[PDB]
Symmetry: C4
Subunit: 325 residues, 4 copies
Amino acid sequence: SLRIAKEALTFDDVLLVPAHSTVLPNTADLSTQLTKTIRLNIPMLSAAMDTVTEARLAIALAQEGGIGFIHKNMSIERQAEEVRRVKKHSGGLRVGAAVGAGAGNEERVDALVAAGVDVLLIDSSHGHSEGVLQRIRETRAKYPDLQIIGGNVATAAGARALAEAGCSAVKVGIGPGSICTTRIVTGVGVPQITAVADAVEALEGTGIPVIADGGIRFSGDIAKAIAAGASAVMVGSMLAGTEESPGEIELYQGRSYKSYRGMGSLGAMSKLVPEGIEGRVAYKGRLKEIIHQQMGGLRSCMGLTGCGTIDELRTKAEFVRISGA
Amino acid sequence: SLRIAKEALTFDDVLLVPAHSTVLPNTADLSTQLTKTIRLNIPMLSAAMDTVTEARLAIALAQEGGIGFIHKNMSIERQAEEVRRVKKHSGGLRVGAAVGAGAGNEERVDALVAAGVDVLLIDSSHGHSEGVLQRIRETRAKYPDLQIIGGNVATAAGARALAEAGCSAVKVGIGPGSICTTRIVTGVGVPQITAVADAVEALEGTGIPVIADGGIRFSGDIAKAIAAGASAVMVGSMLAGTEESPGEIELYQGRSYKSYRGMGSLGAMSKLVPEGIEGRVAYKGRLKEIIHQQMGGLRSCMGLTGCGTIDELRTKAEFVRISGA
Amino acid sequence: SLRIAKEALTFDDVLLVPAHSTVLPNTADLSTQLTKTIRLNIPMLSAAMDTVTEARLAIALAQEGGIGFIHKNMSIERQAEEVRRVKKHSGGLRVGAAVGAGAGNEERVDALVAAGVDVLLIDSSHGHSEGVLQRIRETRAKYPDLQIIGGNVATAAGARALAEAGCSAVKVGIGPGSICTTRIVTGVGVPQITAVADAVEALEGTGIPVIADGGIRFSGDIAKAIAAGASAVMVGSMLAGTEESPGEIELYQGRSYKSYRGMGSLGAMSKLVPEGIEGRVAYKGRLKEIIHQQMGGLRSCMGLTGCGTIDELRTKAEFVRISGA
Amino acid sequence: SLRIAKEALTFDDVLLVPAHSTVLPNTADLSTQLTKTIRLNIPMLSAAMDTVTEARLAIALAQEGGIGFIHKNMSIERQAEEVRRVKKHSGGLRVGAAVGAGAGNEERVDALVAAGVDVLLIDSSHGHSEGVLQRIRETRAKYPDLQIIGGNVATAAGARALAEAGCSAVKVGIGPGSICTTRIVTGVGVPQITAVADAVEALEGTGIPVIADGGIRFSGDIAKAIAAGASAVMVGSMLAGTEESPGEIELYQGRSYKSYRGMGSLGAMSKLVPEGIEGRVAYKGRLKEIIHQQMGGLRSCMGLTGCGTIDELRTKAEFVRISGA
Ligand SMILES: C[C@@H](Oc1ccc2ncc3c(c2c1)CCOC3)c1cncc(-c2nc(Cl)c[nH]2)c1
Ligand SMILES: C[C@@H](Oc1ccc2ncc3c(c2c1)CCOC3)c1cncc(-c2nc(Cl)c[nH]2)c1
Ligand SMILES: C[C@@H](Oc1ccc2ncc3c(c2c1)CCOC3)c1cncc(-c2nc(Cl)c[nH]2)c1
Ligand SMILES: C[C@@H](Oc1ccc2ncc3c(c2c1)CCOC3)c1cncc(-c2nc(Cl)c[nH]2)c1
Ligand SMILES: O=c1[nH]cnc2c1ncn2[C@@H]1O[C@H](COP(=O)(O)O)[C@@H](O)[C@H]1O
Ligand SMILES: O=c1[nH]cnc2c1ncn2[C@@H]1O[C@H](COP(=O)(O)O)[C@@H](O)[C@H]1O
Ligand SMILES: O=c1[nH]cnc2c1ncn2[C@@H]1O[C@H](COP(=O)(O)O)[C@@H](O)[C@H]1O
Ligand SMILES: O=c1[nH]cnc2c1ncn2[C@@H]1O[C@H](COP(=O)(O)O)[C@@H](O)[C@H]1O
């Protein structure tokens, strides 16, 4: 018999239900616990991608109440300096940095901790791999108070494995990324709404938050991911093409564009087969206006569902399942 | 676990079932109770939109047996005068007018009642909000015999809240509008066929009619909304572009067009994020021919289902659920 | 609660299951009982449409083993003569003719019986209407041995009503036609695979055959309709544009075309609202080659399912339900 | 009642679930048992098609660890020589050859066995036909140790019939082929994921492997077919257009192309109605690079699911069912 574990739902399969409300959108509280010790003012994390987050974007997002993750596609010294630029900037801004879950990253981790990184991100395409869990346990043993985010997983067993390995937060997302091709390459993936809810249910009572990573296209997707139980979302394409993101602005016909590619694309890699594409994204302008629009959407959702806080949205808001029609 | 209340159906998910009939389409009775005191000759209400209903369109629709709703996107004096133009016109025509459910609308309400409004519409994007319910209770206490329509809701709890607050009729529709973007902006919405049936079931035995507002594209949608339990439908895009609607006729290539926009669009608003789009609709001609075609479709449905009255269509007609294919 | 009778399936929702077979496609028997007295060599009926069947097409199809139905969109004398042309032609060919189920058709019926019609077709868009049933009972009382086909219905109750009224065969199809717009105009319809199976189940043990009318696009649709329980299919678009069909061949760019329209289209009608469209269909050539291709498809199905006769296909062949993917 | 055996799933209906892993993609073992005596290094079989496999392609694939099947669309002497070219080539390469399941193929079979064929393929569009089973039983009685593959089937009963008739391996696939039109022509077919799992369940404990034949578009489809229980896959379009495939390279605008057609197409046939199309496929280059890319995809799947061997992927990997969205 076919080994079907369950049916799984994506953002477009569901809608949030309007409910009794004493919440006006302008009164909604967007603060969230990223970890037990780190509280963000907005539930936004920027992707650890070489076309998305470097010190400039990490500074702009932290200023909006979120947090950036400096990508690992650079030298140890360049990354430690990128972290130093964010930390040494005025305002007491928080920063995160990504590391590979393979052998020979102890040096990179030691440098980032010294540079003052607030949260270390163990960046894996398969968080349920034994090698990833081992590296996390080792990092936890060496740095007992360091805030660690481990990912990516898309199951209850995967979330429990990362929490047991020492993770301060668990990142969810196997195949939902706008630039992902793993569903076609490996045939592997879990629709994000089910992936998040499963990971959240597995971690109930532990105080370990879940980050919904990948596939956020609109502010409505942000709202859905949070009501599925995520404490925050991680975005790539939503912040790609912004002024603050790395790389140069390019002109095609008349419209301005920026590069956006998966970290598993042929370009980002230069022997695994690619699991990501290389694309062009339209120039979005300043990050501040993007965040204001998206958070505004989230605020209006909170008004419609009568959820005054992120925690209320996470635990009270209900969904309806819809057809393709 | 994912908090899925139920699966919800839209117009395209269902079809009406043909049944034994002694009803010829030309013999079908289209009259309906809008409220316990107001009976319409056709189950048609025009949308309270600045690109749809002003005195001219309200006069033409009332002449066809329906009722118009003068939009709130004007001064108090202009609106009271628009109501006076419809009331003072010969034929003893009925009119409705829309008001916001916020603070400082008591003055607008007093002026509309003085002008002779037959039905006051409390026009909210979220009828289940405490502020909306409070304003309704206050209006009911001040004007005990005034016919009041409150909306919008899309749940059984929302319909009960509006009926308990004093509403003479409840308006249903969260996200189905042709110009709506709330599903993408907030992630909130309820497919209209389920939304209507839920609200109708909640109000059974109360004598409070349900209005199906939004997403009516064809006469088949009208028939479906009524068999889902609605006593009448409210239409925006179906009457936009008609000769009688406000605004000027514009020429693009050779074809004539008129403006059609959500009341939550950037244009209609000029700090909430927009929940509606701004568009162009083809010039439809006289309202009379549109109503004759649409009511004709409804008449043929009534013949096919053997339902001689609106009340029979509401309570007897059955559906089949269909796939995307 | 929403009055959903059941889920209903169309041709594209299902596939036939291959089974043990001793049947080669060239050995399959395509003969079928249209009525208890009329046996056809192929399960094909041509539509009673003014762009499909007149004496020329009725002669060509009867020669292939099927039967034509002369449309009612002409004078009584012209129709009686069209029937006489088919009957008086050599080969002992069978013909059918269509009549409206309204008042003042007794004269048309008397003329067709005199002209030698083998099967009278009471042609209604709503066979479950009391007026249709009454006219059938009257025709049966006047002509006790006349083969009568009544339609259209799409339910078990509708099939039983027609069989009780005196029908020799029941025609199924509410909304499946390629040129139908009733689903959009009235919101009424039943997906054809469910409609046929329901009507067949209602008539089990009665010996009254079911005709699957409308929506046949490919030979695979023919096979599915028969395995759903239909004894024969009725086709419009499949035979439109053939050399033998009425009307003139028209040239557009370089390709040859013929007119194809619903009997409920504005053109075919010239006060009901139209329930059909007016279109152009590509010139198909001789009917003989179309029938050879389509029957060939049916033969290969019979080989794949191990069904040597139409009756075996009707009662033994199984389906699988498929998704949109 | 409608005779629906069950719902059936295709590749796009499912996704593989990531799981605990100690498997790195470079460490995955791709070897598989094609039969109890024949073990392949990669789970790849090339289609027995006149636009896909001749001696040149059969040599290149065997060199990669797979096996080719020389098509039957040639003379007995040409086919025996094509088999001799592969066998006599250095490296001790294995080859297969296809034969029709009709009368007068005993001569073709005797010649292929003499030429040194490692596996005889009884090539039928309907493996559950009595004629096919009879020819297999006869071949098994004459050549008791000859490795025989019989197909095609898409049910549990069909798999059991082929295994009982003497098949060393069973081939599954009724309608999934990229160039197949049987779903439209006959209305027959079974979605491949259900077809494979059903055939595998029927053959559990017998040691008779199942080959998933048809519809493989991406490496993700390969992974899914194997986790559905197939020991190997058979590919047509994936290897069409390669340098090693038969036929000439053609130039259209600037891009290079090769012919790809079903064996049931009008062209491949030159009295059954065609069940396949004739098309052009882009020139893919050397087979070696195609296999490296596709096997790489399979390796990454094995890493994601924690399945170190083909047998582990076949029996341990789980699926989630997804919607169209
Ligand atoms: C080619 C490259 O692809 C990526 C890179 C980054 C990703 N980042 C996040 C996600 C995915 C990613 C894929 C795919 C799943 O969804 C989330 C890659 C890099 N290193 C390891 C793998 C791998 N290991 C196993 Cl085991 C199977 N393949 C893949
Ligand atoms: C921007 C503007 O958008 C509209 C306007 C009119 C509407 N009229 C009807 C409907 C919708 C509408 C949206 C959306 C839901 O479906 C029906 C708006 C105006 N004032 C309040 C809101 C709001 N309050 C909460 Cl709380 C959340 N957002 C939204
Ligand atoms: C306009 C015209 O439309 C047709 C004509 C022929 C048809 N022939 C077959 C079918 C349909 C047809 C619709 C629609 C349903 O599917 C099968 C029409 C002609 N006379 C009566 C009706 C009618 N009576 C009720 Cl009561 C409701 N409307 C409709
Ligand atoms: C026209 C030709 O078509 C093919 C040829 C090769 C195929 N090879 C594999 C598959 C299919 C094929 C169809 C269709 C089903 O899926 C797999 C054909 C050749 N000889 C027999 C048949 C046949 N016999 C029965 Cl009985 C019904 N029709 C069909
Ligand atoms: O090449 C890749 N393949 C698959 N997923 C990737 C790749 N690179 C990054 N990702 C993921 O995709 C996310 C961005 O998704 P987006 O916001 O939908 O564009 C990142 O945060 C990663 O988890
Ligand atoms: O900006 C907006 N966003 C969402 N819904 C709106 C907006 N403006 C009006 N509506 C609703 O949409 C209805 C019109 O829907 P339509 O008939 O499908 O075009 C109105 O009666 C309102 O209930
Ligand atoms: O105007 C019309 N509307 C709806 N159905 C029609 C109309 N005219 C004919 N039909 C039906 O459509 C059938 C033809 O369907 P087709 O074979 O799919 O084109 C006829 O046999 C009638 O039952
Ligand atoms: O004409 C045909 N019709 C249907 N299936 C065919 C035909 N010719 C070959 N096939 C099947 O299609 C397979 C190739 O499928 P593909 O890999 O999806 O292109 C072959 O291995 C056969 O089983």
